[PDB]
Design a binder for this molecule. Structure first.
Ligand SMILES: [Zn+2]
Ligand SMILES: [Zn+2]
Lengths: 370, 142, 407, 249, 40
């Protein structure tokens, strides 16, 4: 209402004037379905410039770090009405910013309904459940016979709201959630998406097995690029369209100016022989007219494909990719290390995104394109 | 332009779906050329976007485009005559939709054909002219 | 035991359960005209139509059977049209069927993409596409428009898009007017409308009118959507419309108002412009004639640089002209520090690209008299060197030396 | 006339603040921390003294920007007063769709103090006549705000349930019920009670949407009242309702 | 883990030991000395 005769009742239902002269208010204030004890003594007159405000220790614990805001509102604020308005909204904010202290689930619906749906599913799918029953992780199999996991994080009310679904595979899963839909519904959506992608998975697993995956190491299921090794100290990375995997990916070659050219030229002339009925490897073989090494490892266990500047493999994800256009050096480098070096030198001139300089080891012209 | 492009398109998905999306809006369009351009674009997508992705996911997309093009057999003479020059070559590089193509032609044939024998003008020559307000014009160059 | 089903079986269609495409024993033409002449010879001949659609409406309160009535029919002897479409070849049943079709459609607003990813609403709009005859174009139009006007977005988006098959050459202009009322009514939805009004069959003065109905609310577009409009405006240019439109726009457009998605969308903007100005000699020249006609107000804005630099970089025929204007305007106590500072504090990432363009200019300015000019040509170098690449830095010091030893 | 004086600091610092605003047409000072020190009555008095309503739309937002940098926040009240002061004239001026700035403004501001803002503006923009295309679009956009909190949407729903309903008050409500917002049967039953009392499409769309998304909420009691409401086949798309209506029983 | 929202807590599958005592070894693992309620 307009007058604080009724508006006070309407907006603080549980504040009981104790004295005849409305001077001791006591009882509860509401917040996020939670009542908190409060005795708010005023002077003989209606002044908040001077008022007492005492609490339950629960209450003070929650309004730790606003004691000043409280004092300021008491002294600046017109009436009690808006005092309680502001205080209440402030309690709302305190709690939401401490959101991590909440979520008693309703057991008569939760723990039972969840077990019933786990029964409906079957106990070969599930892989993980938290002691608080917040986090779950489930398995399904491909027709290929691959384990694909799916984490769900469920709320105090699972059926009410959508369970947040976290999944490895690359393209985004969309789940048409109704409160009528369930774990089985979303599992079926997951199976649908799975069986949709299977082709892409078949391609990725076929490359991981029959080729030397280089840049990704035990790659996860979201990864669509594949830095493959081929010949020696030349790589090709491939990023694949998840919907059209068999379709031509985005492709390129790292390595020697003299090595990389004939690959580019061969790619240009043959690309029409590419055919999306075959596998990516079976198409690469006929387009690039070569076969791949399968992890040429033990022979050359200290041959130093490493930076030759920092002398290390694996600089902060980065790999020795930039090489010398020379038969006698072939000394690989890092982008990072060769830029940092060549920047210093007198001889080094920078065009737009390129630096020409001398190879550290052999002092021959080497080009770096950032 | 569009011949040059296609080595892109068997490779690409994104670009193909863009070309189609654009040509869609050239077919309803206001200026004349938009149609004969969108026709030329489909003819050439059907031609070299598959011999016959997955074949099940080409035969429905081709038969979708063909659904578009039955409209163009409806449109005026210039836009038709392009499809009669074009269908031979479509079939030549992409044989399999001959069974959809020929019906599509045969149905357009039937609209001018009088299939009772010993009826002496065997063809409807008087419906192959659009005359309104003394504009005397070929539609359907039979 | 219903007139509909009975007379459908008489006319030679097999009316099925709901789980597969409905068969057809006879030709579609034969079927259509047979159904017509059977009802004609039937008593209560105008009145049977009500009972006909009553039988139809009672049947299709099952969704699956309705789907089969909407789906492509089975041909015994090899693919054919949908039953509802085939009913809608007939002039006498058409208006009512449309009425009933339309009537219930809004049950299907919320329960979309059910089972096998099927769009019952796009199903049912599609069922109108390319009717040879619609009897009462006006009735169709007014219902369909009331539909757009009320209905939620996603769906209405689809309707909007799908308007130009549907409408006959009768009524495009009508639809023209009601969308223009949607346009001033609805900001959210300038975009597809724009596509549709581009692909409909119209009067140009109408299209001009609506174009201004954009630009008055060009203040009021959501940011993402700016690009897409502006292209239209610069396709809605003739050789004669140009200054007018650019002048209003050159006033209207802010670049100050618009603030990570912000910068991306701004780039999109300049790109779209970039593509326009690329392609109309008329636009580039006229831009600059409608900046120099705003030499008068020394309150003209950031955009009036960025455009020049862009237009210098992009368009080369103009190089002399921008430099003439830039000297003439900066001499006048217009373009200054506060502008040039503001340009390179927010719009570096725009200008990063136009590295070589800024400095061709800076080199043009220091060869002058009038410390006002040379101050500007310097400040150019300072910002150039602050914000850009290391290559730009090298070029700065390169050209500084060139002054120092020659100048 | 009421003989309110601003705190002494403010009457003295009044010209510093009047200096700052001018700058912002063409990081927040501690002078701006002094907006706290104003009571909203005092602020009401000040914002009138500052001449907030006069701004460019550019400047308005820049300032909103600046008021959102307040640590601590503006109290529910100032923000109220402010918003009343900053915007309301601007909204009530509106002939056309509100400017993207103001779009941005109202969104911007509403984001943090979504309740104070729409607490302030909701009621009076709607109990206004001449409330037209543009305005309703602002309130729709408010209720589609991603920020706009479940609890806050319900406070919004709460406060819309106070109002006089016409054409415009449904359009707000639909678009807010199109965000599938939970209810007490109290609020639900009064939405329905309110709703049921009549040829306007808005009427129906509202009806339709509630019957479908909130079926699960609807008692038989409600369903009977829907029955009476569409008795008038002045209602279009009647047949649709009847299906949904029937589908519940 | 500032600190921690809820206290969700494991047993180590021992009974009611009242009057616990911990010594930090870091010699293995942590090794503590307790009195079970039954007098052990
Ligand atoms: Zn290195
Ligand atoms: Zn070397």
């Amino acid at each position: 209402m307009a007058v604080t005769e009724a508006s006070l009742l309407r907006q603080c239902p549980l504040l009981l004037p104790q004295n005849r002269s409305k001077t001791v208010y006591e009882g509860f204030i509401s917040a996020q379905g939670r009542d908190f004890h409060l005795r708010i003594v005023l002077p003989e007159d209606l002044q908040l410039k001077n008022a007492r405000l005492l609490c339950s220790w629960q209450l003070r614990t929650i309004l730790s770090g606003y004691h000043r805001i409280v004092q300021q509102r008491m002294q600046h604020s017109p009436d009690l009405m808006s005092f309680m308005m502001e205080l209440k909204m402030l309690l709302e904010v305190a709690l939401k910013n401490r959101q991590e202290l909440y979520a008693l689930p309703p057991p008569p619906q939760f723990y039972s309904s969840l077990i019933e749906e786990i029964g409906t599913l079957g106990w070969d799918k599930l892989v993980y459940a938290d002691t608080c029953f917040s986090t779950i992780k489930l398995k399904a199999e491909d027709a290929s016979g691959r384990e694909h996991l799916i984490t769900l994080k469920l709320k105090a009310k699972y059926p009410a709201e959508s369970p947040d679904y976290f999944v490895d595979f690359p393209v985004p899963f969309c789940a048409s959630w109704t409160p009528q839909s369930s774990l089985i519904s979303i599992y079926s959506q997951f199976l649908a998406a799975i069986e949709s992608l299977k082709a892409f998975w078949d391609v990725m697993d076929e490359i991981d097995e029959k080729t030397w995956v280089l840049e990704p190491e035990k790659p996860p299921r979201s990864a669509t690029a594949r830095r493959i090794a081929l010949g020696n100290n030349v790589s090709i990375n491939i990023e694949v369209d998840p919907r059209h995997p068999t379709m031509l990916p985005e492709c390129f070659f790292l390595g020697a100016d003299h090595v990389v050219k004939p690959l580019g030229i061969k790619l240009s002339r043959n690309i029409h022989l590419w055919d999306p009925e075959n596998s990516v490897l079976q198409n690469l073989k006929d387009v690039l007219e070569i076969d791949f090494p399968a992890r040429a490892i033990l022979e050359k266990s200290d041959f130093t494909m490493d930076c030759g500047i920092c002398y290390a493999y694996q600089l902060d994800g980065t790999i020795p990719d930039q090489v010398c256009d020379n038969s006698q050096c072939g000394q690989p480098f890092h982008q990072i290390c060769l830029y940092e070096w060549l920047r210093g030198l007198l001889t080094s001139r920078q065009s737009f995104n390129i630096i020409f300089g001398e190879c550290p080891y052999c002092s021959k012209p080497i080009t770096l394109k950032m | 332009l569009l011949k040059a492009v296609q080595p892109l398109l068997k490779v690409s998905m994104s670009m193909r779906d863009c070309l189609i999306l654009v040509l869609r809006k050239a077919m309803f369009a206001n200026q004349l050329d938009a149609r004969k351009s969108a026709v030329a674009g489909f003819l050439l997508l059907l031609k070299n976007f598959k011999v016959l992705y997955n074949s099940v996911a080409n035969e429905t997309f081709c038969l979708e485009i063909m659904d578009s093009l039955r409209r163009c057999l409806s449109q005026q003479a210039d836009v038709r005559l392009m499809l009669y020059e074009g269908f031979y070559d479509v079939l030549r590089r992409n044989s399999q939709l001959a069974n959809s193509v020929m019906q599509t032609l045969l149905s357009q044939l039937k609209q001018f054909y009088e299939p009772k024998p010993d009826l002496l003008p065997p063809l409807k020559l008087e419906a192959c002219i659009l005359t309104q307000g003394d504009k005397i014009s070929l539609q359907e160059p039979l | 035991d219903s007139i509909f089903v009975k007379l459908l079986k008489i006319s030679g269609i097999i009316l099925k359960t709901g789980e597969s495409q409905n068969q057809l024993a006879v030709d579609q033409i034969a079927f259509q005209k047979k159904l017509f002449q059977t009802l004609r010879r039937h008593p209560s001949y105008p009145k049977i139509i009500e009972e006909f659609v009553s039988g139809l409406e009672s049947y299709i309160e099952d969704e699956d059977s309705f789907r089969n009535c909407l789906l492509s029919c089975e041909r015994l002897q090899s693919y054919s049209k949908s039953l509802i479409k085939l009913l809608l070849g007939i002039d006498i049943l058409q208006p009512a069927i449309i009425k009933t079709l339309f009537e219930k459609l809004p049950e299907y607003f919320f329960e979309n993409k059910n089972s096998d990813e099927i769009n019952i609403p796009r199903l049912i709009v599609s069922q109108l596409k390319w009717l040879d005859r619609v009897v009462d174009g006006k009735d169709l139009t007014t219902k369909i428009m009331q539909l757009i006007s009320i209905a939620p977005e996603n769906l209405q988006h689809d309707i909007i898009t799908s308007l130009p098959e549907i409408l006959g050459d009768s009524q495009h202009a009508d639809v023209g007017k009601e969308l223009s009322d949607l346009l001033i009514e609805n900001t959210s939805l300038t975009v597809p409308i724009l596509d549709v009004l581009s692909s409909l069959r119209l009067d140009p003065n109408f299209l001009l009118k609506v174009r201004q109905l954009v630009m008055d609310k060009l203040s009021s577009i959501r940011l993402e959507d700016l690009p897409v409009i502006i292209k239209f405006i610069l396709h809605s240019v003739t050789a004669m419309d140009t200054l007018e439109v650019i002048s209003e726009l050159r006033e209207k457009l802010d670049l100050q108002h618009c603030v990570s998605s912000g910068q991306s969308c701004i780039i999109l903007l300049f790109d779209v412009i970039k593509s326009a100005i690329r392609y109309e000699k008329t636009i580039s020249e006229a831009w600059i004639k409608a900046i120099e006609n705003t030499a008068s107000v020394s309150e003209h804005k950031v955009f009036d640089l960025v455009m020049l630099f862009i237009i210098y970089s992009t368009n080369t025929q103009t190089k002399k002209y921008i430099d003439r204007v830039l000297r003439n305007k900066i001499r006048s106590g217009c373009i200054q520090e506060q502008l040039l500072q503001s340009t390179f504090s927010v719009h570096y990432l725009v200008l990063k690209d136009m590295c070589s363009s800024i400095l061709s200019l800076a080199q043009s300015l220091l060869h002058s008299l009038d410390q006002s000019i040379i101050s500007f040509g310097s400040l150019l170098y300072k910002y150039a060197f602050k914000f850009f690449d290391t290559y730009c830095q090298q070029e700065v010091v390169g050209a500084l030396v060139t002054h120092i030893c020659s100048g | 006339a009421e003989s309110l004086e601003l705190p002494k600091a403010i009457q003295d610092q009044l010209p510093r603040l009047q200096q700052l605003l001018k700058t912002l047409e063409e990081a927040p000072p501690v002078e701006l921390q002094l907006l706290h020190e104003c009571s909203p009555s005092q602020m009401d008095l000040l914002c009138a003294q500052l001449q907030l309503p006069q701004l460019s739309d550019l400047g308005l937002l820049r300032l909103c920007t600046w008021l959102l940098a307040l640590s601590p926040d503006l109290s529910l009240s100032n923000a109220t007063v402010l918003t009343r002061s900053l915007f309301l004239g601007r909204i009530l001026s509106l002939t056309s769709s509100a400017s993207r700035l103001l779009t941005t403004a109202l969104t911007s501001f509403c984001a943090k103090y979504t309740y104070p803002v729409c607490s302030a503006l909701l009621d009076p923009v709607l109990q206004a006549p001449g409330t037209g295309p543009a305005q309703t679009e602002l309130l729709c956009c408010l209720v589609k705000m991603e920020s706009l909190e479940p609890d806050a949407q319900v406070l919004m729903l709460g406060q819309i349930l106070e109002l006089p309903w016409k054409e415009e008050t449904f359009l707000v409500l639909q678009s807010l019920l199109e965000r599938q917002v939970e209810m007490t049967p109290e609020k639900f039953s009064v939405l329905m009670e309110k709703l049921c009392k009549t040829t306007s499409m808005a009427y129906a769309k509202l009806m339709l949407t509630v019957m479908t998304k909130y079926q699960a909420n609807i008692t038989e009691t409600q369903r009977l009242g829907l029955a009476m409401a569409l008795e008038p086949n002045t209602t279009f798309l009647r047949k649709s309702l009847k299906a949904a209506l029937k589908h519940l029983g | 883990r500032p600190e921690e929202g809820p206290g969700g807590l494991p047993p180590m599958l021992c009974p009611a030991s009242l009057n616990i005592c911990s010594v930090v070894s870091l010699s293995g693992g942590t090794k503590l000395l307790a009195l079970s309620a039954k007098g052990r």
